[PDB]
Amino acid sequence: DIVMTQSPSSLAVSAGEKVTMSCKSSQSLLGRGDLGRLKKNALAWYQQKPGQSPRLLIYWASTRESGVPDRFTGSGSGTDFTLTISSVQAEDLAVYYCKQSYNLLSFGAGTKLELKA
Amino acid sequence: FNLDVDSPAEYSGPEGSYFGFAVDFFVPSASSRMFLLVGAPKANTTQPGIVEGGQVLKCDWSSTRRCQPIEFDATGNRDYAKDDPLEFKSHQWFGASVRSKQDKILACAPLYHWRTEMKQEREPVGTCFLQDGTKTVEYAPCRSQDIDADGQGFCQGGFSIDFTKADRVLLGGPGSFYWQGQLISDQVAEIVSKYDPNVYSIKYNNQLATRTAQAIFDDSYLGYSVAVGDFNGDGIDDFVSGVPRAARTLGMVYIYDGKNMSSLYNFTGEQMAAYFGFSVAATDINGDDYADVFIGAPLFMDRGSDGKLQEVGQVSVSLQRASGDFQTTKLNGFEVFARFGSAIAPLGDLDQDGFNDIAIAAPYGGEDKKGIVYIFNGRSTGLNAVPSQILEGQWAARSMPPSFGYSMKGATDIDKNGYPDLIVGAFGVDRAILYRARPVITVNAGLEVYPSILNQDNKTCSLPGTALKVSCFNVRFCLKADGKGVLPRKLNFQVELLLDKLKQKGAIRRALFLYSRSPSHSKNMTISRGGLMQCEELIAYLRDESEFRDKLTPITIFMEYRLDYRTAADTTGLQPILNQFTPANISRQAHIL
Amino acid sequence: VHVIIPTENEINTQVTPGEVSIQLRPGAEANFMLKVHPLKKYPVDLYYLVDVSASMHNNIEKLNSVGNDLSRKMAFFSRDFRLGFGSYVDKTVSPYISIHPERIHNQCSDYNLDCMPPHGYIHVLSLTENITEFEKAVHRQKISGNIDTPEGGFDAMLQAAVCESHIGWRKEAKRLLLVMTDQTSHLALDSKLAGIVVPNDGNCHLKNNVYVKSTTMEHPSLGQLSEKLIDNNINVIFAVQGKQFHWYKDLLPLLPGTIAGEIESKAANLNNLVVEAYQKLISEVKVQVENQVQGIYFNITAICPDGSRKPGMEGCRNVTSNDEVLFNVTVTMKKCDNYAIIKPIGFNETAKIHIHRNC
Amino acid sequence: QIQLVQSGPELKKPGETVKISCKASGYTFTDYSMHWVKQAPGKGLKWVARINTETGEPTFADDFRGRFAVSLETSASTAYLQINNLKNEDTATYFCAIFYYGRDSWGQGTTLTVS
Numbered sequence A: 001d002i003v004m005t006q007s008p009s010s011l012a013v014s015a016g017e018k019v020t021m022s023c024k025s026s027q028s029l030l031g032r033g034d035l036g037r038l039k040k041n042a043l044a045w046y047q048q049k050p051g052q053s054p055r056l057l058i059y060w061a062s063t064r065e066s067g068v069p070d071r072f073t074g075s076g077s078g079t080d081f082t083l084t085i086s087s088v089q090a091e092d093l094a095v096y097y098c099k100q101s102y103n104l105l106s107f108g109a110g111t112k113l114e115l116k117a
Numbered sequence B: 001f002n003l004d005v006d007s008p009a010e011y012s013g014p015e016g017s018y019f020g021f022a023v024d025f026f027v028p029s030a031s032s033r034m035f036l037l038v039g040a041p042k043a044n045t046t047q048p049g050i051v052e053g054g055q056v057l058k059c060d061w062s063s064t065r066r067c068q069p070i071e072f073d074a075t076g077n078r079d080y081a082k083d084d085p086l087e088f089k090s091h092q093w094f095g096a097s098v099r100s101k102q103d104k105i106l107a108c109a110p111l112y113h114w115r116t117e118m119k120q121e122r123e124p125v126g127t128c129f130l131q132d133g134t135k136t137v138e139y140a141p142c143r144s145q146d147i148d149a150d151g152q153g154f155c156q157g158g159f160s161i162d163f164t165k166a167d168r169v170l171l172g173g174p175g176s177f178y179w180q181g182q183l184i185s186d187q188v189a190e191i192v193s194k195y196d197p198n199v200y201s202i203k204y205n206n207q208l209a210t211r212t213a214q215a216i217f218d219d220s221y222l223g224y225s226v227a228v229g230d231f232n233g234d235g236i237d238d239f240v241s242g243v244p245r246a247a248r249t250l251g252m253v254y255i256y257d258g259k260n261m262s263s264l265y266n267f268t269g270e271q272m273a274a275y276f277g278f279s280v281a282a283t284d285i286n287g288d289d290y291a292d293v294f295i296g297a298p299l300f301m302d303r304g305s306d307g308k309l310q311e312v313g314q315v316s317v318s319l320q321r322a323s324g325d326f327q328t329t330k331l332n333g334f335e336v337f338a339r340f341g342s343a344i345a346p347l348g349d350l351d352q353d354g355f356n357d358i359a360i361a362a363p364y365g366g367e368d369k370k371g372i373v374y375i376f377n378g379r380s381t382g383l384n385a386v387p388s389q390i391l392e393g394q395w396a397a398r399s400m401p402p403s404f405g406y407s408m409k410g411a412t413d414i415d416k417n418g419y420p421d422l423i424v425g426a427f428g429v430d431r432a433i434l435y436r437a438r439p440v441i442t443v444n445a446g447l448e449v450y451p452s453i454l455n456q457d458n459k460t461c462s463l464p465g466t467a468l469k470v471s472c473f474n475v476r477f478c479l480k481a482d483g484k485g486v487l488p489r490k491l492n493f494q495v496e497l498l499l500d501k502l503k504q505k506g507a508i509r510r511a512l513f514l515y516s517r518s519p520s521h522s523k524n525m526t527i528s529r530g531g532l533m534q535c536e537e538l539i540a541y542l543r544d545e546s547e548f549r550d551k552l553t554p555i556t557i558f559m560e561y562r563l564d565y566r567t568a569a570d571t572t573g574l575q576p577i578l579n580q581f582t583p584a585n586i587s588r589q590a591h592i593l
Numbered sequence C: 001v002h003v004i005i006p007t008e009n010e011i012n013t014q015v016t017p018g019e020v021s022i023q024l025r026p027g028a029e030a031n032f033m034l035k036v037h038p039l040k041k042y043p044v045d046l047y048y049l050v051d052v053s054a055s056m057h058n059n060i061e062k063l064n065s066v067g068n069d070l071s072r073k074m075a076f077f078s079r080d081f082r083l084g085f086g087s088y089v090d091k092t093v094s095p096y097i098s099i100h101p102e103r104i105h106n107q108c109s110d111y112n113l114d115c116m117p118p119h120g121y122i123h124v125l126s127l128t129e130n131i132t133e134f135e136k137a138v139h140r141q142k143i144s145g146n147i148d149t150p151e152g153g154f155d156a157m158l159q160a161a162v163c164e165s166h167i168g169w170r171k172e173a174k175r176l177l178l179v180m181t182d183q184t185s186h187l188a189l190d191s192k193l194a195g196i197v198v199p200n201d202g203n204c205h206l207k208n209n210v211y212v213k214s215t216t217m218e219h220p221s222l223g224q225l226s227e228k229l230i231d232n233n234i235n236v237i238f239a240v241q242g243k244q245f246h247w248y249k250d251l252l253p254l255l256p257g258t259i260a261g262e263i264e265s266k267a268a269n270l271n272n273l274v275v276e277a278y279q280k281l282i283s284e285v286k287v288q289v290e291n292q293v294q295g296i297y298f299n300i301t302a303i304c305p306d307g308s309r310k311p312g313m314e315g316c317r318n319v320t321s322n323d324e325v326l327f328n329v330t331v332t333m334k335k336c337d338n339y340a341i342i343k344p345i346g347f348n349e350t351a352k353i354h355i356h357r358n359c
Numbered sequence D: 001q002i003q004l005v006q007s008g009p010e011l012k013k014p015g016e017t018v019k020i021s022c023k024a025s026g027y028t029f030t031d032y033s034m035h036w037v038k039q040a041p042g043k044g045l046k047w048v049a050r051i052n053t054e055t056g057e058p059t060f061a062d063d064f065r066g067r068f069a070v071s072l073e074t075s076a077s078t079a080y081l082q083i084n085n086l087k088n089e090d091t092a093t094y095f096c097a098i099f100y101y102g103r104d105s106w107g108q109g110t111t112l113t114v115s
Ligand SMILES: *[C@@H]1O[C@H](CO)[C@@H](O[C@@H]2O[C@H](CO)[C@@H](O[C@@H]3O[C@H](CO[C@H]4O[C@H](CO)[C@@H](O)[C@H](O)[C@@H]4O)[C@@H](O)[C@H](O[C@H]4O[C@H](CO)[C@@H](O)[C@H](O)[C@@H]4O[C@H]4O[C@H](CO)[C@@H](O)[C@H](O)[C@@H]4O)[C@@H]3O)[C@H](O)[C@H]2NC(C)=O)[C@H](O)[C@H]1NC(C)=O
Pocket: B212, B213, B214, B215, B217, B263, B264, B265, B266
């Protein structure tokens, strides 16, 4: 059972800005795969709009899911991962969750984006 | 040419054990008798709970032909915690690789797995058992805290082993660091002294090893095959290591300094997927006091006249020169898909000609893919590319080719005759076959004509019966012979002398021996080896000017000799052979005036 | 000494004469011209042999766009286009895979995605005219994994090429074997590490579409691989995404009849690779002779439409429709002691020559 | 197109048992596990359990034990989450999902309220 810490829980953004949020883990999420040194990170990001089921954006902390706009970039390694949204849109006002799958599956707290006014 | 392949000693093990997979010799400093070491990696042991654990057997030679297991390990799997096994010896392939230095026997199990302390898993780390004196210890240089694929967890230490004349053991562990491979070498004294059966991870102080590098070297399998010899003139045997997938699977052979592991040489193959470096060996093959390098590449494809690729197998040979440079030549195999070069086994100076000789296997060649072993003699110019003797497997495949020649070891004299012998495995049929070298006889064969100047006018002696005068000349010949090892003092030779035989049958022969009026004579000769030349003289004469085709021709005086091969044997029935690099057919010319 | 060219009804459309009979005496030579004339609008059998180890996940998902789009493009190069499908990973033995009871259950450390059990080679879809079945075979394909990066590509290829009755290769077709990967393959002697020292016999070993000798027999050599691919008239196309492409490219000289190209990092050219590879293969015409006749030697030179000459297996390039390539075949006898086969590589038709000796 | 169809809202009393279903379509149901995730009304997501339809064997989170059971009805490509002895803290939306990276899916969620 791996603990995920996600922050900040309340993120102020404005359309066109670069928006960042982070997730940290109690242990390394890096496992052994089909590549020698290029190990995959067992971490994915989801976007959940109010009243909706969540959608997958990023998996293995890098690769984007088909249909995901090229402004959602995930990166990181070990125990420290981030998500950056380039030119954030007013349509990206959703709660973002990070989920680890190194062993027992679990989710982070959730980061809510709201517009600056 | 002198190996006795007519009466070899045949040994066998349990069906399916792959008996004969790996072979070596056991020669204690003071046993007065030698044993063979024959591995059987899939043998069913008596150990409590181990299936196909593998074993090594000590085989006798004098008297009967029987093999018995060596108790390197007489227990089962040790526990780490209650109901939690530490190690998995099942299918460990113990006996897959065996080497011995006089009394010291090193036998490895490359597929041995263990859990590591941190968490449960099954890592193929590999272990070896080293026996000396009356004590046996476990050696496992990769069974440490550097675990997983980026460590030594997948090392398979003991995959390929050899010994250093400095009393060190060289272990190739091709799986280290994502299969980059690692060489680890340590001292026998450290391995035996620093041993504690309650310790899984043991540190040694005089250990040398290679190191991990960039990902571009992944999947190279360094330490796939190892060998030793002096390649820098420091008096210290260095480390030769095959790396079959190196350099974009061209394959490479590396030579590391045996004192500090600094790299000395890099041999690179030319053809992709020829698997250059499959098997490596080193020996002085030309009498230059420098170790020479022999590298197999069993999958090499040789292009024909239309560019068609024939998979035959290739062996690269290079001589070491004093300047530090190598002189490289190439030897190709003879049969398609036989995988020539799969095993290089120096024989030492098997034919006692002053140069070391080498046996090169081609395990899937010959009729029914029984397997072939080619013996190539040495010489001052390097290995002779032309084989002098060819050995073949004597068993049919039962489920797989006998793979005769898969593993071989030479340069050990078992029958004590001065001529080193050769053990060849054929594991596909669970057999091992020992060939012994025959003594070699070099013969000094003289032939002279007195006078060489002969004619129809100079009548000098009379014939028997009717005293007709003829032109006479004497033909002399003589023989001396010896060997370098144990040979019968009395050699039995057959010699035949012919006069003017070098012409079309039906033609008149001009020169006859006067005692019988015949152009031919043979004699039974007994010659003491190392003694005086035994000579004989016959008087020959020319036909007179009434019985001829011509008057002025050359006269060929021809001498042929051979061994009896009935009384020519030692106490075990081993017969000597005449040196096959010398003629036993010689001649002289006399001239008619 | 003579050459007999049969005037009997021929049973070949591309290679003629498909039968030649000659009479030799020691020191004699004889020759003839062999015609090779490629067809347009072939029946084409395309089999997808896909690497399904974990790193291929992001390329496999793009095969779902291949069925209908490729079928449309091939409409201008072929008359009857069929698709098939299968997959491979590696030999299911230590050290290539984990053998721990808990890890083998999931076959990966990723607990989000369900990895399928590892396997050597599995046939999934027989070659068929049904495009929908191809897309479905791909759509439900799960990803697997292993520990070692190199894959059992050559082993899977041999089975795909040899097991004709299971794959459904047509004789009346251009047989294309497409190998999709990003990593290099294992070699015949690599298997020693797993304790496999038993040679690959080159036979077919499928049961319920599953290769069952994968854990007892070693990988095939390149020599064995090219022999079987040519013998079964299969044109191999390699599609490689990584830098490993160059590894495959430089093995092409060792694998006659084989072509290779690159997969883009976005895998946006999967269909373009197949179509372009097909178009290049159809324009390359070369022959080889299988000569089992002792004492007899062959010397074959390609005579090209542009006036050039290319000896042996070099063949001619840029061959089109209504375009013949002539092969000059000379047979020379060195000694007295059967038949030989001369065939274009990658073609279904061959010419058999019977060589008699009057001694 | 992969779809997941869940049952509608449930109004339960304390101590009662609720069976929350999820019907799968558009794919080979028996080849993928199905995951259940709890979304408390105003909190983030918490993973509850997975059922591997290949074998029928469930796995649960360390916290979500005892009161939670998961079972299958493969004959209709569906799965059930059964929550026993419902407590007020069990009020949440329960989602079923497929987590294969290249073929995921979430259902609409079932709303469960406990008196
Ligand atoms: C036979 O052929 C073999 C090759 O198959 C050849 O051995 C190789 O030698 C080269 C050096 O020539 C090794 O490459 C590196 O060498 C440096 C030595 O430092 C000097 O040279 C570098 C330039 O390469 C200069 O910049 C430097 O100032 C010095 O002059 C080592 O320091 C390298 O070590 C790296 O790997 C270590 C792993 O433990 C790391 O700890 C270390 O920090 C280095 O990592 C680097 O790369 C990382 C990315 O992968 C990066 O993150 C790090 O920050 C850092 O930049 C390295 O050894 C090469 O590895 C050798 N290969 C093998 C297989 O041994 C033999 O010499 C040749 N023999 C003969 C007789 O011809």
